[PDB]
Write an enzyme that holds these catalytic residues in place. Sequence first.
Site, PDB file in Angstrom:
ATOM      1  N   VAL A   1      35.598  40.866  47.151  1.00 51.17           N
ATOM      2  CA  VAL A   1      35.996  40.976  48.551  1.00 51.17           C
ATOM      3  C   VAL A   1      34.794  40.676  49.439  1.00 51.17           C
ATOM      4  CG1 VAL A   1      36.747  42.507  50.395  1.00 51.17           C
ATOM      5  CG2 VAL A   1      37.775  42.708  48.119  1.00 51.17           C
TER       6      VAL A   1
ATOM      7  N   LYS B   1      35.254  45.811  51.510  1.00 46.85           N
ATOM      8  CA  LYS B   1      34.081  44.946  51.360  1.00 46.85           C
ATOM      9  C   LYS B   1      33.112  45.479  50.312  1.00 46.85           C
ATOM     10  CE  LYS B   1      31.064  41.631  53.122  1.00 46.85           C
ATOM     11  NZ  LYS B   1      29.852  41.985  52.329  1.00 46.85           N
TER      12      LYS B   1
ATOM     13  N   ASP C   1      57.213  30.953  24.898  1.00 50.79           N
ATOM     14  CA  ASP C   1      56.162  30.108  24.398  1.00 50.79           C
ATOM     15  C   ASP C   1      55.902  30.578  22.993  1.00 50.79           C
ATOM     16  OD1 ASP C   1      56.022  29.146  26.989  1.00 50.79           O
ATOM     17  OD2 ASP C   1      54.112  30.010  27.429  1.00 50.79           O
TER      18      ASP C   1
ATOM     19  N   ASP D   1      56.000  35.689  24.854  1.00 53.44           N
ATOM     20  CA  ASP D   1      54.904  34.926  24.285  1.00 53.44           C
ATOM     21  C   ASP D   1      54.767  35.219  22.806  1.00 53.44           C
ATOM     22  OD1 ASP D   1      53.965  33.651  26.763  1.00 53.44           O
ATOM     23  OD2 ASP D   1      53.552  35.715  27.326  1.00 53.44           O
TER      24      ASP D   1
ATOM     25  N   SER E   1      52.794  40.906  28.074  1.00 53.18           N
ATOM     26  CA  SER E   1      53.122  42.210  28.631  1.00 53.18           C
ATOM     27  C   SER E   1      53.865  43.072  27.626  1.00 53.18           C
ATOM     28  CB  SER E   1      53.983  42.038  29.884  1.00 53.18           C
ATOM     29  OG  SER E   1      54.885  40.955  29.718  1.00 53.18           O
TER      30      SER E   1
ATOM     31  N   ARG F   1      51.944  45.396  25.282  1.00 53.33           N
ATOM     32  CA  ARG F   1      51.245  46.463  25.996  1.00 53.33           C
ATOM     33  C   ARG F   1      52.146  47.653  26.323  1.00 53.33           C
ATOM     34  NH1 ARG F   1      48.781  42.971  30.780  1.00 53.33           N
ATOM     35  NH2 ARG F   1      50.921  42.176  30.597  1.00 53.33           N
TER      36      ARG F   1
ATOM     37  N   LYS G   1      40.409  39.892  57.500  1.00 51.13           N
ATOM     38  CA  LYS G   1      41.857  39.796  57.380  1.00 51.13           C
ATOM     39  C   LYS G   1      42.423  41.188  57.103  1.00 51.13           C
ATOM     40  CE  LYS G   1      42.357  35.023  55.495  1.00 51.13           C
ATOM     41  NZ  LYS G   1      41.280  34.401  56.312  1.00 51.13           N
TER      42      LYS G   1
ATOM     43  N   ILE H   1      57.422  21.633  38.837  1.00 51.20           N
ATOM     44  CA  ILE H   1      56.953  21.111  40.130  1.00 51.20           C
ATOM     45  C   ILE H   1      55.625  21.766  40.499  1.00 51.20           C
ATOM     46  CG2 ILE H   1      57.418  20.797  42.583  1.00 51.20           C
ATOM     47  CD1 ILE H   1      60.238  20.491  42.107  1.00 51.20           C
TER      48      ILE H   1
ATOM     49  N   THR I   1      57.209  24.599  44.686  1.00 51.98           N
ATOM     50  CA  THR I   1      56.401  24.929  43.499  1.00 51.98           C
ATOM     51  C   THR I   1      57.003  26.081  42.681  1.00 51.98           C
ATOM     52  OG1 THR I   1      54.759  26.435  44.527  1.00 51.98           O
ATOM     53  CG2 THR I   1      54.332  24.084  44.707  1.00 51.98           C
TER      54      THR I   1
END
Length: 314
Positions: free
Chosen positions: A56, A51, A241, A183, A171, A174, A63, A97, A92
């Site tokens: 958060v 917290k 892409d 990409d 990625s 990096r 939880k 979708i 999904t």
Amino acid sequence: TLNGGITDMLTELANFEKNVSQAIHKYNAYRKAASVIAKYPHKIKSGAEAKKLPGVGTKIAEKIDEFLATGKLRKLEKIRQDDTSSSINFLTRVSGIGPSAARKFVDEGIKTLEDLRKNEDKLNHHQRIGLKYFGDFEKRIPREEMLQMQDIVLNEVKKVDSEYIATVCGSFRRGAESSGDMDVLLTHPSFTTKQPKLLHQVVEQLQKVHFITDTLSKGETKFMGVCQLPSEKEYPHRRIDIRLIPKDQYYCGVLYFTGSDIFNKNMRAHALEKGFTINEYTIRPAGEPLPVDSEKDIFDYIQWKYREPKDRSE
DNA sequence: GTCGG
DNA sequence: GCTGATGCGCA
DNA sequence: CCGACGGCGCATCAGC
Ligand SMILES: [Cl-]
Ligand SMILES: [Mn+2]
Ligand SMILES: [Mn+2]
Ligand SMILES: [Mn+2]
Ligand code: NA
Ligand code: NA
């Protein structure tokens, strides 16, 4: 992964909010928590400890207490127990979708890959492709293979025109050992009037040499599609892409697409401190676009020592 | 869901 | 036939 | 208590 148990729980919650509840803000809230906890250098012993972290709050702390105490979360148990939620969530995973199509299908009694395969007629071109390569698209891409893909893309680009600049970001740039996809950013001295076919040329070439095997969407600035290394055990098909951006929006584009979406968020955070606002196209004082002829430059703005790609996961 | 207003 | 409306994926 | 929380390029298609 000091707190993977927790970040997994939070990410499964986010996916549920996005896919089933269609609550994109909660989806984002959960992802924000997951990221602040994934960057936290201690093993969390309580919700009250989490917290302390921004992103958060009350509910997530609770939880977290339940998870640390039981190793499970009743809400996720329940969710995964429901047929509709679980089925919508699953579908999904097919590229093309979304929450709306997933929910439409499930309501029709279409809830599995098999069901999808047994209803080609109710799938559009993109969804047929995501289905065809479902497993493939879930696989990671070994860096060794990225380096090989990069080779083909740079070379064939050169063959169309000796001036195009192609850079593989995400990625990969990096230094990452594996990638979810490839990409590609593309520029050309002639585009900063307009001219059609600038991207189309590169795409057509890569198709001619059979690297790009499928198209998901294609316009004059963005290509989304499928590609595959030549062959032995065929290599899996991969997502690529390609983005054509103005040569004068180069570094902002590269910096932004390099990856560490996190890194982006906080370089944005420190941008509006010395009163700047950076997006993928420009840095502005808002004002007119400040001159950019390097990644360091963008830093120079908000002070800030130049982070090299392979250091900016953070 | 979280945080600043 | 058309296109405004909507869905989708993406650092 | 309450509203802000990223925007856009491209594809599809219900309702004219
Ligand atoms: Cl929401
Ligand atoms: Mn069935
Ligand atoms: Mn990527
Ligand atoms: Mn990507
Ligand atoms: Na907090
Ligand atoms: Na999907």
